[PDB]
Symmetry: C2
């Protein structure tokens, strides 16, 4: 194959261009969220995508460099509608340069557990989400096809509370992720995620689109019981004595509104702290989905809450329907490794009290 | 073929880079002999060849452009051991950029005859020689192999007068072209070309071996004939008094040394002008190769000398030992193309004599 070998040679040459970019007359820089800069050459990213073409063309004249300065592209000020890391950026640029995908570095898409195969857990998933969003915004259709195929293949195993973020990002995209959007939507619909849970962490248009679908399979679950909406809307807006007086006013089973789980998962740490300082609601009374208070406390990655609820005597050895305790929730939430030390501190507490 | 398709897309993108260099932020220009400029981006040619990387690293500080102009590379100062046109440079740059070779524009690898088959005439060989030299000096091994194989399988069909320049360039190139050098050298040695031509059109460190190729593969060819050497060295020195005095003393036959052939081939138009008027020897006599004076005159690109010969009555109806008249020499020796018109001035002069 004389034809293919020359193509291989071109690909290797440009891969060597990317690997050592300082030496080969690199011009521009992409500046990330935290502040890392990745060097690149205007020619190749101008040619390989329309988006960078428009961006560089626009940014040319508005400034003069006199060969003593580059042009900087702020990924925080361009890809506005989501947040991305560093290794995904490296992967996308490496695909642009060398026409092949680069496997992620060690200890990134692997979480903490002993025998978590690292296929569906949180780090692998959100790595895929970051690279898919970057490819969508940068207009590379084939990379869209590949990574959308990956997510669509894995989507069955993942837990619902991450299928939600998958759905959110899929809606962030356009028609490019139509298959993923529809599959994920029909996954969520047949489940039993409560009204408030969808309303809090999904756009209004989409929650309408799903709540008028709930009653279409013949599955009659309307939105009722506006009584607890007062407590929820009164405690999400950071007021405590108000809800104390309200609960003491009508005497309408505070715990039965799952105020503990709601405040632990969606409210702020101070609010949950004072709510647990008050002692008028049970702690092991699990919510309709099947999560106790400390399950979601661990999933939120807040060590102060975990230790405080350990002080309340809540049984930290009771598993959900799937069978996962606080230890394994905390393990599969985190990323194995100037980083986020929250996750690695909660795992320790649940291996201690024995 | 997923893997092949990505490489194909990369190649097409970079070809689209090359085709329109102004839009994709070019940074340097090659400049040819006549003064034509070809735009190129320092990244790709820095990566694809060591020689360009060295040249650019040398030129990176002499002139600080500060976005006032680009850095222009003078080809003569770069590869000064041979001459190169334009379409060959375009072809080599296109191969480097897009990993495939672009055929020359219609009319450059073709002669002016409409009966030739256009596989071994003069421009066809000239194009290949130019591209082979450029590939050798740019250090592009596979292009070397391809064009070397082209010339290698063609060499055994081209008239010896072009085999001489083929060998000259092959000796210019190093051991990269050994399979061409030995082949062409053997073809030359086995022939009956006279020794004076070899002495007059090659370096000495090569003829010193061409002598032994005949003195060792069996034959005893070398003559002496120092007597005519004085006539030769007098005539080639743009003199007439010396040759007249030397030929008026010994009264040696001018037709033995074939002086008209020497004057037409390796002498200026002045000696031809002051010797052809001097009518003392036959015009229709041929050297051991088998060419008349008119044949070499046609091959020389000297229309004025050809009209001078036609004044003196040289028969154009007689054919060489290769079976060719003067018309077809004149036609096949030019190309079918705002340039040096003088090639197509000769063909008419010799044509209408019907
Ligand atoms: Zn895992
Ligand atoms: Zn021809």
């Amino acid at each position: 194959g004389p034809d293919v070998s020359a193509l291989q040679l071109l690909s290797n040459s440009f891969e060597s261009v990317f690997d050592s970019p300082d030496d080969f007359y690199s011009d521009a820089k992409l500046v990330l969220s935290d502040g890392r800069e990745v060097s690149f050459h205007r020619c190749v990213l101008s040619a390989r995508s329309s988006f960078f073409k428009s961006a560089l063309a626009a940014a040319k004249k508005e400034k003069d460099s006199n060969n003593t300065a580059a042009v900087k592209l702020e990924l925080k000020e361009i890809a506005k509608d989501y947040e991305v890391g560093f290794d995904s950026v490296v992967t996308v640029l490496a695909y642009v340069y060398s026409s092949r995908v680069r496997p992620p570095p060690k200890g990134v898409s692997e979480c903490a557990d002993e025998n978590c195969c690292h296929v569906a857990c949180r780090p692998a998933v959100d790595f895929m989400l970051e690279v898919l969003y970057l490819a969508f915004i940068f207009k590379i259709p084939e990379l869209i096809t590949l990574y959308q195929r990956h997510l669509l293949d894995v989507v069955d195993k993942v837990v619902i509370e991450d299928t939600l973020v998958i759905l959110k990002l899929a809606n962030i995209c356009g028609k490019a992720c139509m298959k993923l959007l529809d599959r994920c939507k029909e996954i969520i619909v047949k489940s039993n995620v409560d009204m408030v849970s969808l309303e809090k962490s999904l756009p209004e248009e989409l929650v309408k689109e799903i709540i008028d679908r709930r009653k279409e399979l013949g599955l009659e679950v309307p939105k009722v019981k506006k009584h607890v909406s007062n407590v929820h809307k009164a405690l999400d807006s950071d007021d405590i004595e108000l809800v104390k007086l309200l609960l003491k006013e009508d005497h309408t089973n505070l715990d039965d509104a799952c105020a503990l789980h709601f405040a632990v998962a969606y409210c702020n740490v101070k609010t949950a702290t004072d709510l647990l300082k008050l002692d008028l609601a049970d702690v092991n009374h699990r919510n309709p989905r099947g999560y106790t208070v400390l399950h979601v406390a661990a999933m939120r990655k807040e060590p102060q809450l975990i230790l405080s609820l350990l002080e309340k005597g809540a049984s930290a050895s009771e598993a959900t329907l799937e069978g996962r305790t606080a230890l394994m929730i905390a393990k599969q939430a985190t990323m194995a490794v100037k980083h986020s030390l929250k996750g690695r501190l909660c795992v320790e507490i649940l291996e201690q009290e024995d």
